[PDB]
Design a protein that fits this description.
Chains A, B: It is found in: Cytoplasm. The structure is a homodimer. The first copy, chain A, is α/β, with parallel strands linked by helices. The first copy, chain A, has a single domain, classed as P-loop containing nucleotide triphosphate hydrolases (Rossmann fold, 3-Layer(aba) Sandwich). Helix content of chain A is 36%, strand content 19%. Chain A is globular and about 65 Å long. Chains A and B meet through α3 and α6 of A and α3 and α6 of B. Bound molecules: adenosine-5'-diphosphate (2 copies).
Chain lengths: 307, 307
Amino acid sequence: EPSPYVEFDRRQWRALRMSTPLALTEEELVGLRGLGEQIDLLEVEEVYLPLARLIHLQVAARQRLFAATAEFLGEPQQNPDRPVPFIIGVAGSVAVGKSTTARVLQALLARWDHHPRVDLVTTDGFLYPNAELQRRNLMHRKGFPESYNRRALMRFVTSVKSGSDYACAPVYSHLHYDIIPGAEQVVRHPDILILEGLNVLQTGPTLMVSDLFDFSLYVDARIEDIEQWYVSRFLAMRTTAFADPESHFHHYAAFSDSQAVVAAREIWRTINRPNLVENILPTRPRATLVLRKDADHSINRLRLRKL
Amino acid sequence: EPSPYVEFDRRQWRALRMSTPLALTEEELVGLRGLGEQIDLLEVEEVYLPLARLIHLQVAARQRLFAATAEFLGEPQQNPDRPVPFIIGVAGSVAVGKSTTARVLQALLARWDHHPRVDLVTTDGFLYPNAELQRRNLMHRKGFPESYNRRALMRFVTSVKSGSDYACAPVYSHLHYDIIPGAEQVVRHPDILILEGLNVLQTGPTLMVSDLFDFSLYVDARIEDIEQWYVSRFLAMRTTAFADPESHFHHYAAFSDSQAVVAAREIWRTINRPNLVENILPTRPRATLVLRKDADHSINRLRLRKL
Ligand SMILES: Nc1ncnc2c1ncn2[C@@H]1O[C@H](COP(=O)(O)OP(=O)(O)O)[C@@H](O)[C@H]1O
Ligand SMILES: Nc1ncnc2c1ncn2[C@@H]1O[C@H](COP(=O)(O)OP(=O)(O)O)[C@@H](O)[C@H]1O
């Protein structure tokens, strides 16, 4: 039976790397991975390099596509130095490694000879402020579709892909657990934009951001494995993030392995798991490429969307 | 504020026709329109011709796109005489003229110099048989998402776009109001496939048909105007379709204008309107091109998706 997909194991996937060059040191790579992520240069070669290639083969191809509409409408032509921004989306559960994958990807893509302006934006900054969240009674739904100002989010990406000179996005603080007053991230007509978020790939009664993606990634892994990464990281943060007195979570630093595990699991059980099951996972089918990571965080399976 | 859309009035739209040739007589056009549709050669020139152009500009462009993935995967190349089928979807309410628009489009596209194999398939044949509908208690939800064997529908389109030599689809009888036993529509690797249906443009927790469209159309019009076309056509069918003794609706032929109007409205109120409002209209935002028709069935506004 025919399928819209094609799957590989790392062995099959790596052979598609070809000549793509590795332009990242093992040290640069470090400042790119988040706590708990195992990414090393090898994985960047057998997995991220082919991927970088695929994306580059499509950037050109995807443009012939907008050219047509421009030609059809009988408009000016190029401005080879201001084409239509290539939008890439990275989706996946909390603690699955999206940020690592997105930062690495941005590092690889920016380090290509064109030296493209590759901007990265997370939907974090599009959550509603805690005050506003409390108003709607959503302080325990942070991450669910309704906890984001999607109108703003959509306005943003649309602006960037429609060729605006610059666009602004609010900024979220993981330290204070809230939106930073007056903080803004300005994006100036990038060549490529990477939007990272749990709910980037979702669809709805209104034109959404997933409808503006030219390529998409879904970082996947077993649910019990992700809970594990989540709990584990929670305990680990007792001495890194939580250790800071300014942290909205400083009280967890004192917890014992045992209590921390109990706490980490309750949050996972009442917030992140339900959201992953009800909102995130149902979007996985639409991702151009799904990266299957096993229990050790290693990506060794991939599902590509050819149709 | 930037938008993913661009709108035109017929005046602006017609100028994009250019040189596109009219290869249809006023007589050929006739056997293409359904009862009540006002389409004439003029509209085919000021509206359908530009559209035919746009589509042709994209067929080429859309292919450079699959080429890339083929090149990336390091596969054989062309077979210029078996490229990836261009899938087009035509959505819209019951009685809005989809079938006319789809048949005309197919006529125009087939009559292009390449003389492409342009097949047209309606989702009608993918409804569940009345017996099966009765089992699920859906005899009054015919047209709603759940009244279709979408797995089959998806299997079909996927097969055709994945390059199969041929694919089969069941056949629906408007006369007997049910699926025709043993009837099948065989589609052989067309160059272009047009899928016509109320719910073609919808999205869901699973990869769907709308996800395989390379271009899409949404025939629109005011809701009170469509009800009008529906009721009006119901009465008109008393002497055409319903007049046949074999019709599952032959009993309506006898109705008086007044009773028929009462009946037509109850069906519209309890079936077609709810479905249009709850399922069809919410998909309009995702259509590549929306054709706004006014009360006289004339299309004089269009909304194009550039993003
Ligand atoms: N409470 C926290 N305090 C500080 N940093 C955090 C906190 N929670 C998560 N982070 C970091 O911010 C990012 C959050 O990632 P998550 O939201 O867990 O998605 P993912 O792990 O897939 O990137 C990661 O870099 C994570 O290490
Ligand atoms: N009860 C019926 N009997 C015979 N033909 C019908 C009947 N209802 C609709 N048709 C015809 O079949 C097609 C049904 O179209 P509809 O399902 O009303 O969508 P649309 O009008 O947008 O094409 C049209 O050609 C219509 O004229």
